[PDB]
Amino acid sequence: MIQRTPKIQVYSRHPAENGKSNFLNCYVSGFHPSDIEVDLLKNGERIEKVEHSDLSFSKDWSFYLLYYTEFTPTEKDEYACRVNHVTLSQPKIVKWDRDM
């Protein structure tokens, strides 16, 4: 079988402004097979009220999911997406960069 490793973007729904509530997105795509673990982290710790889109896929059969949660960006809180998948020896953690 085919095994394709997830691409990851972490970003906010709206322009990030400290003190203003917003949505924190983790968009995983390009992956196969479909079983995948995605957490959103605040300062290294699992956020617990995290939802996701329904599983779909692109033309090349690779899957995509959006995980999101409500958050309030802050000057010094650190947010990240943590992803595991068979294609990964170890959980991948990608830090949210508000510029991106």
Binding site: M1, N25, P33, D54, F57, W61
Partner: protein, 275 residues
């Protein structure tokens, strides 16, 4: 503009215990309007867009009946495919199917398509002319001989050319306020002093719909790909899309770079320039 209706089915066997996970999602253009998930509590086709909630109980009953019967056919398929490929019962495997129809800006039929994959690879697909099949390998060949000798393509064509287009038109009407609406990208440029000598310009396109878009940099009115980075278009989470493109540039030379944005919601392309 042009339109489509599509369905995406995914079925994943669970050798540990129980029966395959089955997920269907339906889209009009880039708008998901239904879903089914065999693990969810409702065991019903559920709405995902406000305009389909206008369909009454009969619609939801019928879509539920069909989607549950579809899940069963995929369950059978997973068993057959395991045998075609001589696989053990110990591994998890995946079927995917996507099919749908396109209509032009006049709403006349343009094309239909049905595609099937096993374990993430092409397996069998309908041809453009909706009349015969294309098999990727010798297992899919076995399937294709079956489906040709039994003229299975005629029914697929009847659906894709017929019922798919008529219901697509019905949704386009019912969901006019949004489906026939175009949201032009909201654009701006940011500026990140990378280092002493080089700066990164980032051209942003936000909250646009549909997802199709082109972002392009020019330097002095010529296309520029060198030192460029373009991220994959991504869902905002509210039904619109986001994308950006960046270029690295000598500090002080920002003005010679332009960002050009094409999108269906734009009467002319936009041009952005850092000043």
């Amino acid at each position: 503009g042009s339109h489509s209706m599509r369905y995406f089915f995914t079925s994943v066997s669970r050798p540990g215990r129980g029966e395959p996970r089955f997920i269907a999602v339906g889209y009009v253009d880039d708008t998901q309007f239904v879903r089914f998930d065999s693990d969810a509590a409702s065991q019903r086709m559920e709405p995902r867009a406000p305009w389909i909630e206008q369909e009454g109980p009969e619609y939801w009953d019928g879509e539920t009946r069909k989607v549950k019967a579809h899940s069963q056919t995929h369950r059978v398929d997973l068993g057959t495919l395991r045998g075609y490929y001589n696989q053990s019962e110990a591994g998890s495997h995946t079927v995917q199917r996507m099919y749908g129809c396109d209509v032009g800006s006049d709403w006349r039929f343009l094309r239909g398509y049905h595609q099937y994959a096993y374990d993430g690879k092409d397996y069998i697909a309908l041809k453009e002319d909706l009349r015969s099949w294309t098999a990727a390998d010798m297992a899919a060949q076995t399937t294709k001989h079956k489906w040709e000798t039994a003229h299975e393509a005629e029914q697929w064509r009847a659906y894709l050319e017929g019922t798919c287009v008529e219901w697509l038109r019905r949704y386009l009407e019912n969901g006019k306020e949004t489906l026939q609406r175009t949201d032009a990208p909201k654009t701006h440029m940011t500026h990140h002093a990378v280092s002493d000598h080089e700066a990164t310009l980032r051209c942003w396109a936000l909250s646009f719909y549909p997802a199709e878009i082109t972002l392009t940099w020019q330097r002095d009115g010529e296309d520029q790909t060198q030192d460029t980075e373009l991220v994959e278009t991504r869902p905002a989470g509210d039904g619109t899309f986001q994308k950006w493109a960046a270029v690295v540039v000598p500090s002080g030379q920002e003005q010679r770079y332009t960002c050009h944005v094409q999108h269906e919601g734009l009467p002319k392309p936009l041009t952005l320039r850092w000043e």
